[PDB]
């Protein structure tokens, strides 16, 4: 009897948890990180998955694959596929109607279906759970967006199967976040729950009804092309402008310099969720020139003020769509690292006239956490 795990297979990051000894442990990976980039890369000599692949994207852009969740269960001709292809540095090719990513690997052209890319991410999740537990892991609950269709769900199950997992169930991300908070451990009148999920690359607002432990998705809204990366990118452009003033050089077209800056911005955005100042510290950013600087929480908020305000439009839209008043939402659940941003929490809480936000489970972990609870239930370990 190996325990079952919960796996959040995310667009930008993935996360795995396990229920044991009465609580969920979110498992840190081989780099010590509790989330792993949903990235895979191929070199002359090896296949990288997770942090190692993300860390070399600028050095090897055409052979580094990400956003495979944007392709999973899609057909090559799909409008979304054709549009998304224009933003990716890797090739997507048509295999008799199905998209495949095409890379070079150990000197040969190789191509992979979306679910094969995702199975590699799921193999890494599996292995880092096995390293932490010291035993084999086979059973898992895997999560997907509430708006996934049959094709997209079945392709994600296929990624699981290819990875050597027995997928116990596919459950929706917003339901998993609600299970994490024990919101379905509840009898009495129907409760409306709003999940506000601002991930690295997508923004999902979901209203669920939960009645005697049974979920229904009442409405969904959001923007599948807005996420924490957009806020990072506002900071990147701000610091490109600053480096130009201070050194009269535009780094804009050195992709290695821009990626090092972007990584420093992603770290600074997380730092600004807890502190009012964060540094940007980069040795030899460009032609040997160092870049050591800093930013306030206020300036980061200013750079993103329109996008932050704009997150309330999908909330209004979910509410209209669900025929519900603000006041009829019983619980609000935060998901995604960006929901730690104080200014976002203020905007959302003021929108809900002071209503408290469920945020005590790390929001970048909450989907894996709910999946791990459901996995243990389905296994009989809870
Ligand atoms: Cl994500
Ligand atoms: Mg997510």
- State whether 339 and 353 are in the same domain: yes
Cα–Cα distance measured from residue 316 to residue 221, given in angstroms and rounded to the nearest whole number: 9
From which experimental method does this structure derive?
Answer: X-ray
Give the CB-side neighbour count of residue 132, counting CA atoms within 13 A. 24
- State whether 74 and 210 are in the same domain: no
CATH at 106: 3.30.30.30
What length does the chain have? 382
- State whether 204 and 106 are in the same domain: no
- Does 10 count as an annotated binding residue? yes
- State whether 162 and 52 are in the same domain: yes
Question: What is the residue whose two structure tokens read 């199975």?
Answer: 119
- State whether 159 and 37 are in the same domain: yes
Q: Which ligand has the nearest atom to the CA of 7?
A: 2
Q: Quote the ligand 1 centre to 198 CA distance (angstroms).
A: 8
CATH at 198: 3.30.420.40
Residues 6+ away with beta carbon under 8 Å from 177: 195, 197, 333, 335, 366, 367, 370
- Does 273 count as an annotated binding residue? yes
- Does 13 count as an annotated binding residue? yes
Q: Quote the ligand 2 centre to 295 CA distance (angstroms).
A: 27
Q: Which ligand has the nearest atom to the CA of 13?
A: 1
- Does 201 count as an annotated binding residue? yes
Q: Which two tokens stand for residue 278?
A: 């964060």
Cα–Cα distance measured from residue 233 to residue 303, given in angstroms and rounded to the nearest whole number: 10
Residues 6+ away with beta carbon under 8 Å from 106: 42, 43, 44, 45, 46
Cα–Cα distance measured from residue 367 to residue 17, given in angstroms and rounded to the nearest whole number: 9
Comparing C-alpha atoms, which of 161, 166, 162 is closest to residue 141? Answer: 166
Q: Domain range for residue 221?
A: 186-226+311-358
Torsion of CA 160, 166, 169, 175, to 10 degrees: -60
The neighbourhood of ligand 1, an ion, using CB within 5 A, equals 10-13, 199-200
Question: What is the residue whose two structure tokens read 């025929």?
Answer: 323
Resolution reading in Å:
1.8
Catalytic residues: 8, 69, 173, 197
In order of 129, 137, 346, the CA distances from 134 in angstroms are: 8, 9, 43
For 313-347, the DSSP string reads HHHHHHHHHHT--GGGEEEEEEESGGGG-HHHHHH
- State whether 170 and 296 are in the same domain: no
Cα–Cα distance measured from residue 71 to residue 121, given in angstroms and rounded to the nearest whole number: 14
Q: Quote the ligand 1 centre to 38 CA distance (angstroms).
A: 8
- State whether 61 and 158 are in the same domain: yes
- Does 157 count as an annotated binding residue? no
Q: Which two tokens stand for residue 95?
A: 């295999």
With 0-12 / 13-18 / 19 or more C-beta atoms within 10 angstroms meaning exposed / middle / buried, residue 36 is buried
- State whether 281 and 199 are in the same domain: no
Q: Quote the ligand 2 centre to 251 CA distance (angstroms).
A: 31
Q: Quote the ligand 1 centre to 1 CA distance (angstroms).
A: 31
Rg of the Cα atoms in the chain: 21
**Cβ–Cβ < 8 Å for 261, 232:** no
- State whether 200 and 296 are in the same domain: no
Task: Phi first, then psi: give them for residue 32, nearest 5 degrees.
Answer: 85, 15
What is the count of structural domains for the chain? 4
């Amino acid at each position: 009897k190996g325990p079952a795990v919960g796996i959040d297979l995310g667009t930008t990051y993935s996360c795995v948890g396990v229920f044991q000894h009465g609580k969920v442990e979110i498992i840190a990976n081989d780099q010590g990180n509790r989330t792993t980039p949903s990235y895979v890369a191929f070199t002359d000599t090896e296949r990288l998955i997770g942090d190692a692949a993300k860390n070399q994207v600028a050095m090897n852009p055409t052979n580094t694959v990400f956003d495979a969740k944007r392709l999973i269960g899609r057909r090559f001709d799909d409008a979304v596929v054709q549009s998304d292809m224009k933003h990716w540095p890797f090739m997507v090719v048509n295999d008799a109607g199905r998209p495949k990513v095409q890379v070079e690997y150990k000197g040969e052209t190789k191509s992979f279906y979306p679910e094969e890319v995702s199975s590699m991410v799921l193999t890494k999740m599996k292995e880092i759970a096995e390293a932490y537990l010291g035993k084999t892991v086979t059973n898992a609950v895997v999560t997907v967006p509430a708006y996934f269709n049959d094709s997209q769900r079945q392709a994600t199950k296929d990624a699981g199967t290819i990875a050597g997992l027995n997928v116990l169930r596919i459950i929706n991300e917003p339901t998993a976040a609600a299970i994490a908070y024990g919101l379905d451990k509840k009898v009495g009148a129907e409760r409306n729950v709003l999940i506000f999920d601002l991930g690295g690359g997508t923004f999902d607002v979901s209203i669920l009804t939960i009645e005697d432990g049974i979920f229904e998705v009442k409405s969904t809204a959001g923007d599948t092309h807005l996420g924490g990366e957009d806020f990072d990118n506002r900071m990147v452009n701000h610091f490109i402008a600053e480096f130009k003033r201070k050194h009269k050089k535009d780094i804009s077209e050195n992709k290695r310099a821009v990626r090092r800056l972007r990584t420093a911005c992603e770290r600074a955005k997380r730092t600004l969720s807890s502190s009012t100042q964060a540094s940007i510290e980069i040795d030899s950013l460009y032609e040997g020139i160092d870049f050591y600087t800093s930013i306030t929480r206020a300036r980061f908020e200013e750079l993103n003020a329109d996008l932050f305000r704009g997150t309330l439009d999908p909330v209004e839209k979910a509410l209209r769509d669900a025929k519900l008043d603000k006041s009829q939402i019983h619980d609000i659940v935060l998901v995604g690292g960006s929901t730690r941003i104080p200014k976002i929490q203020k905007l959302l809480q003021d929108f809900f006239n002071g209503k408290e936000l469920n945020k005590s489970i790390n929001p970048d972990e909450a989907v894996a956490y709910g999946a791990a609870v459901q996995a243990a239930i389905l296994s009989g370990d809870k």
